[PDB]
Design a protein around this ligand. Structure first.
Ligand SMILES: O=C1Cc2cc(Nc3ncncc3Cl)ccc2N1
Ligand SMILES: O=C1Cc2cc(Nc3ncncc3Cl)ccc2N1
Ligand SMILES: [Cl-]
Ligand SMILES: [Cl-]
Lengths: 4, 124, 124, 4
């Protein structure tokens, strides 16, 4: 999971 | 927004759609190419091809279970492109590049047409 | 094999599937949650959820145009998860995390359950 | 395009  | 994003989600979705295709699950159309038949999902075909997008948004054709391609279309070129739609992988070879490019132009798959043009220009 | 791969293909496919969903094109099922209705594509739901995979591979249920979820399921939690399925983006917030995790457990969306568990553990 |  990432900060888009 | 303040969303988080799962990097591998789109690839995992496409992998699962290809697994449904392999097992012939929820396929809703047959594409006929020079008497060679390919089962697929209308939505995946539309998501990948400008031609299929136009065909399945047509009020009459959206309801067809069989689509016949132009007789000039090569079944192997179609098969390679169908595999690309479901995997992101294109089996481009010296022996098939002309058929693949002609099929991608007809199907309106602009990124495929682009890489074929570049691979051909490198060989001249 | 000797394939080439188009990096953005899977993301572009998912973006187009979400555009079909927005325009209600080729949606083939209604998911009913506490009298809130959500239109979607069966194949996308199956590609994202172990629950929908099991439902639409069932010989009788594969043919249903309406699916009713358990009354304990929260429509907002479902809506957030449906958006995630079609975009890879999860709108996870302090105010919705419990509903989102409970919905992801019911839908069998293991990666979502994992990030919710981690976000909850960080707040304790 | 890349070599996968
Ligand atoms: O090269 C290409 C690939 C491609 C896909 C589509 N598909 C869609 N476009 C927009 N909203 C939904 C969909 Cl399904 C249309 C044109 C082209 N042209
Ligand atoms: O967490 C999850 C996400 C998920 C998706 C599916 N889907 C499929 N699996 C295998 N072949 C085809 C499909 Cl469509 C099954 C289980 C789970 N569990
Ligand atoms: Cl393309
Ligand atoms: Cl997930």
């Amino acid at each position: 999971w990432v900060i888009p | 927004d303040s969303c988080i994003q799962f990097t591998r989600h789109a690839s995992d979705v496409l992998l699962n759609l290809n697994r449904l295709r392999s097992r012939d699950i929820l396929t809703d159309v047959v594409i006929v190419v020079s008497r060679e038949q390919f089962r697929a999902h209308k939505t995946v075909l539309m998501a990948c091809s400008g031609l299929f997008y136009s065909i399945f948004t047509d009020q009459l054709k959206c309801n067809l279970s069989v689509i016949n391609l132009d007789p000039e279309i090569n079944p192997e070129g179609f098969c390679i492109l169908l595999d690309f739609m479901y995997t992101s992988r294109l089996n481009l070879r010296e022996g098939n590049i002309m058929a693949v490019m002609a099929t991608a132009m007809y199907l309106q798959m602009e990124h495929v047409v682009d890489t074929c043009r570049k691979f051909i220009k490198a060989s001249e």
